Design an enzyme around this catalytic site. Structure first.
Site, PDB file in Angstrom:
ATOM      1  N   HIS A 123      62.176   1.245  -7.363  1.00  0.00           N
ATOM      2  CA  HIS A 123      63.549   1.759  -7.404  1.00  0.00           C
ATOM      3  C   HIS A 123      64.465   0.788  -8.164  1.00  0.00           C
ATOM      4  O   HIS A 123      64.215  -0.433  -8.188  1.00  0.00           O
ATOM      5  CB  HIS A 123      63.961   1.900  -5.924  1.00  0.00           C
ATOM      6  CG  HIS A 123      65.261   2.598  -5.660  1.00  0.00           C
ATOM      7  ND1 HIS A 123      66.499   2.054  -5.962  1.00  0.00           N
ATOM      8  CD2 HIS A 123      65.501   3.754  -4.994  1.00  0.00           C
ATOM      9  CE1 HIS A 123      67.449   2.856  -5.483  1.00  0.00           C
ATOM     10  NE2 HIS A 123      66.871   3.902  -4.912  1.00  0.00           N
ATOM     11  N   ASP A 200      60.424  -4.462  -0.729  1.00  0.00           N
ATOM     12  CA  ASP A 200      61.401  -3.364  -0.569  1.00  0.00           C
ATOM     13  C   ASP A 200      60.805  -2.362   0.422  1.00  0.00           C
ATOM     14  O   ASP A 200      59.918  -1.566   0.065  1.00  0.00           O
ATOM     15  CB  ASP A 200      61.689  -2.780  -1.945  1.00  0.00           C
ATOM     16  CG  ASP A 200      62.625  -1.543  -1.862  1.00  0.00           C
ATOM     17  OD1 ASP A 200      62.925  -1.083  -0.740  1.00  0.00           O
ATOM     18  OD2 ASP A 200      63.027  -1.040  -2.943  1.00  0.00           O
ATOM     19  N   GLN A 203      61.472   2.779   2.221  1.00  0.00           N
ATOM     20  CA  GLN A 203      60.786   4.030   2.533  1.00  0.00           C
ATOM     21  C   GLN A 203      59.595   3.812   3.449  1.00  0.00           C
ATOM     22  O   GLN A 203      58.761   4.697   3.555  1.00  0.00           O
ATOM     23  CB  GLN A 203      60.290   4.727   1.253  1.00  0.00           C
ATOM     24  CG  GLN A 203      61.365   5.124   0.343  1.00  0.00           C
ATOM     25  CD  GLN A 203      62.164   6.342   0.862  1.00  0.00           C
ATOM     26  OE1 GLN A 203      61.730   7.069   1.760  1.00  0.00           O
ATOM     27  NE2 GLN A 203      63.306   6.578   0.264  1.00  0.00           N
ATOM     28  N   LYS A 226      68.495   5.630   6.160  1.00  0.00           N
ATOM     29  CA  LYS A 226      67.224   6.293   5.940  1.00  0.00           C
ATOM     30  C   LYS A 226      66.364   6.279   7.229  1.00  0.00           C
ATOM     31  O   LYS A 226      65.443   7.030   7.353  1.00  0.00           O
ATOM     32  CB  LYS A 226      66.457   5.711   4.757  1.00  0.00           C
ATOM     33  CG  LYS A 226      67.009   6.089   3.392  1.00  0.00           C
ATOM     34  CD  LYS A 226      66.409   5.305   2.240  1.00  0.00           C
ATOM     35  CE  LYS A 226      67.045   5.620   0.895  1.00  0.00           C
ATOM     36  NZ  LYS A 226      66.629   4.758  -0.262  1.00  0.00           N
ATOM     37  N   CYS A 364      66.501   7.356  -9.119  1.00  0.00           N
ATOM     38  CA  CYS A 364      66.694   5.919  -9.306  1.00  0.00           C
ATOM     39  C   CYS A 364      65.395   5.202  -9.667  1.00  0.00           C
ATOM     40  O   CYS A 364      65.179   4.067  -9.223  1.00  0.00           O
ATOM     41  CB  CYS A 364      67.269   5.252  -8.058  1.00  0.00           C
ATOM     42  SG  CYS A 364      68.945   5.958  -7.664  1.00  0.00           S
TER      43      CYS A 364
HETATM   44  C1  LIG Z   1      66.863   3.968  -0.824  1.00  0.00           C
HETATM   45  C2  LIG Z   1      65.990   3.090  -1.618  1.00  0.00           C
HETATM   46  C3  LIG Z   1      66.584   1.907  -2.015  1.00  0.00           C
HETATM   47  C4  LIG Z   1      68.085   1.721  -1.993  1.00  0.00           C
HETATM   48  O1  LIG Z   1      68.644   1.700  -0.647  1.00  0.00           O
HETATM   49  P1  LIG Z   1      70.215   1.828  -0.396  1.00  0.00           P
HETATM   50  O2  LIG Z   1      70.376   2.195   1.042  1.00  0.00           O
HETATM   51  O3  LIG Z   1      70.696   2.938  -1.347  1.00  0.00           O
HETATM   52  O4  LIG Z   1      70.795   0.492  -0.755  1.00  0.00           O
HETATM   53  C5  LIG Z   1      65.773   0.871  -2.487  1.00  0.00           C
HETATM   54  N1  LIG Z   1      64.435   1.126  -2.528  1.00  0.00           N
HETATM   55  C6  LIG Z   1      63.820   2.284  -2.161  1.00  0.00           C
HETATM   56  C7  LIG Z   1      62.326   2.420  -2.254  1.00  0.00           C
HETATM   57  C8  LIG Z   1      64.623   3.329  -1.683  1.00  0.00           C
HETATM   58  O5  LIG Z   1      64.028   4.473  -1.270  1.00  0.00           O
END
Ligand SMILES: *Cc1c(COP(=O)(O)O)cnc(C)c1O
Ligand SMILES: *Cc1c(COP(=O)(O)O)cnc(C)c1O
Ligand code: NA
Lengths: 406, 406
Positions: A123, A200, A203, A226, A364
């Site tokens: 992302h 990261d 998800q 999320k 994104c």
């Molecule tokens: C949502 C997402 C982000 C960004 O998160 P925010 O809450 O918009 O800051 C970064 N990485 C992944 C894999 C995402 O799905």
């Protein structure tokens, strides 16, 4: 199976909504999740009955609000199996957490001539901060390429890791493909070079248990909204030994020990050194409630239900003509697809006209789109409150769109 | 007088709370304000019925949530009389807004050998980011000193402004003393040197109308949670001509135009270039409701009521033996004081034992405490929902404390 989707859905007021006169089928939880009443009400009740500034004010409500905030930090730390609550920093979200690492840790540890490794499926949140860091210090951003099935080409790692590699920044679960990367093994390899690893996890944390001690990652980030929680709050985990050495990023009240206009300023201890000014206390209370709600359902129960729902959807989607899917057969959470030669924008518009919410566009992840030689994809999220009937509506909708627009 | 404090108080559920078995007298709104039901419920209802990711998703709820977010930006811009909604950036709060200016504008406009001017009454939020900037680029942080009455020693400005001064960063209203600074005149003087002016408005925007065009300030910041709104949201205003030239600060999704791992990344337009990742949508909806609520009461009506309440409190406090007040006779919002030789911590603890919430300590203004040669002060906030009876309880409480501890 233990899990009851009808019981869970009863907690989510939005899932009664109509859209375009039709029952909403909300298949966009990967962009942001709906929230249960327990979470909405926990935050509202805090504002209605317990609200005050935090930072250990003298008076009862402030002292109690401060205790609630630190109790959520402890609950979050147990949720990811951090060794200590003091390894977690409250941020706005995954994005801000990555930017904090990139400035505070990156400026002190990445020098001219060094390199950082990301992947082609990241992302933008796990790309742009590193591009900015590389441009600030004169370092190189290297990239693990994709395979056609949406997995990483791990045979390239010997070419990418060398004695100048300082950091691997890598997604736990792709927000588009649903691929889960082999983090534990990748981290062992990074550590053999003395590189650190940021994960990261935005998800991952809603789909199954996450254990940062077993992963041995150096940094881990995720977002509350999320994970069925409020907007404006997220978590950055950093190993204590690293976090204790990191300089502050944002400056202001609450992160100082002393402030002098003639002798300068000194900082407080981690993690509070990283939290400048009034925190998002309402969002923190709501995040605590979301973690409680998810833990009470059980992440292994959630994982079982979601995996059965995903298997059902992939099976049913075989009956859609000219459907292209992107990513591996074992994907988590999301199905990325395009229908024939139709623009994703048009497909998603017809689905919305049917009451079905999917995401369309580049998600994104422009480098990922470019890898697949498409400008955009559709993406259906299949979360713990989604149903077989909603999957059936998606399939029927795609079949109708194919027939109408062909 | 038009204003009815009993009608207003009926909207704030916390003001029915008991503390230590006694009716709460909440005199700490300057640390954070209580919120009316209209604000609490606006955010809850959004989560219950309208929730989705923003960033102009294809489907109905996302498109509608995006429109609501931009409508709040427009409402905020009219509230401070900005020329355009696109001059406002959503941030977590005053603190983050100052840090954004200090990095994005400061790194590009303040060089080695330059100077920045602040004042001795600033909150740490309007000190530390500038100390960090001065240390990054090799610039000097200069300070407008205080007078004994809590006003600025403006006769020093000719000594502080010179051909290397790039920025004046100055509070609108002191969070401790209640002093309102003569911003319009100070800004005229700064501009004659070509310096820009950031105004810290965190203690101004709830007390009377604020008009950034009449002020002609270059940057203006404030926090939602002090303006009867949710935590985790604030506003940074920047003149369009400056904002359009500023580089991004946080990187990630939504603030890019294109992302390439081989050709680099380009940015979107202001203000969205400054908003990386998922915003605090729930907090934004709640902030919109707070602005609506405050505008409906009328800030000139609020100012009249609060000024009459302040005059009453200052008159009544003359009957407290050995009370020291800090700041000018025309103060807004806050009364800072110490009782005899008693530690502020002990005074505030007895007041809390009486059900009365005040703040004690250094109020994030250690240089101000040092100017007055005290480690700490007490501070009572007299906001638009506070009453003469609560003032009477404060006075009686101080009299009792004086008699018991003397
Ligand atoms: C949502 C997402 C982000 C960004 O998160 P925010 O809450 O918009 O800051 C970064 N990485 C992944 C894999 C995402 O799905
Ligand atoms: C509250 C305050 C700040 C800090 O605001 P946050 O909401 O904590 O970021 C800055 N300046 C003044 C004058 C304040 O009263
Ligand atoms: Na930030």
């Amino acid at each position: 199976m233990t899990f009851s989707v009808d019981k869970v859905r009863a907690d989510f007021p939005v899932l009664s909504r109509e859209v375009n006169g039709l029952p909403l089928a909300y298949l966009d939880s990967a962009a942001s999740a709906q929230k249960p009443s327990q979470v909405i009400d926990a935050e509202a009740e805090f504002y209605r009955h317990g609200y005050a500034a935090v930072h250990r004010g003298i008076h009862t409500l402030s002292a109690q609000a401060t205790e609630k905030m630190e109790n959520v930090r402890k609950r979050a730390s147990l949720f990811i199996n951090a060794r200590s609550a003091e390894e977690l920093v409250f941020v706005r979200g995954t994005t801000e957490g990555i930017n904090l690492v990139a400035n505070s840790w990156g400026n002190s540890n990445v020098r001219a001539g060094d390199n950082i490794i990301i992947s082609q499926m990241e992302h933008h949140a796990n790309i742009v901060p590193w591009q900015m860091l590389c441009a600030r210090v004169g370092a190189e951003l290297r990239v693990i390429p994709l395979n056609p099935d949406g997995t990483l080409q791990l045979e390239t790692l010997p070419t990418l890791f060398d004695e100048k590699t300082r950091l691997l920044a890598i997604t736990h679960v792709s927000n588009v493909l649903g691929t889960e990367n082999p983090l534990a093994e990748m981290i062992t390899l990074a550590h053999q070079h003395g590189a650190k690893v940021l994960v990261d996890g935005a998800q991952a944390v809603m789909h199954h248990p996450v254990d940062v001690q077993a992963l041995d990652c150096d940094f881990y980030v995720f977002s509350g909204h999320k994970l069925y929680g409020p907007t404006g709050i997220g978590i950055l985990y950093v190993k204590e030994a690293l976090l204790q050495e990191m300089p502050p990023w944002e400056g202001g009240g609450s992160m100082i020990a002393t402030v002098s206009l003639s002798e300068g300023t000194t900082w407080t201890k981690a993690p509070w050194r990283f939290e400048a000014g009034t925190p998002n206390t309402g969002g923190i209370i709501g995040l605590g409630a979301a973690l409680e709600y998810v833990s009470a359902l059980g992440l292994n129960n959630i994982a079982e239900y979601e995996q059965n729902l995903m298997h059902y959807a992939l099976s049913q989607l075989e009956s859609v003509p000219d459907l292209t899917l992107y990513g591996p057969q074992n994907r988590l959470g999301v199905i990325a697809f395009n229908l024939g030669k139709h623009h994703a924008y048009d497909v998603g518009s017809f689905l919305d006209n049917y009451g079905i919410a999917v995401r369309t566009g580049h998600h994104c992840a422009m480098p990922l789109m470019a890898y697949y030689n498409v400008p955009a994809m559709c993406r259906a999220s299949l979360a713990m409150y989604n149903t077989h009937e909603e999957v059936d509506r998606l399939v029927t909708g795609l079949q109708r769109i194919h027939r109408l627009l062909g």
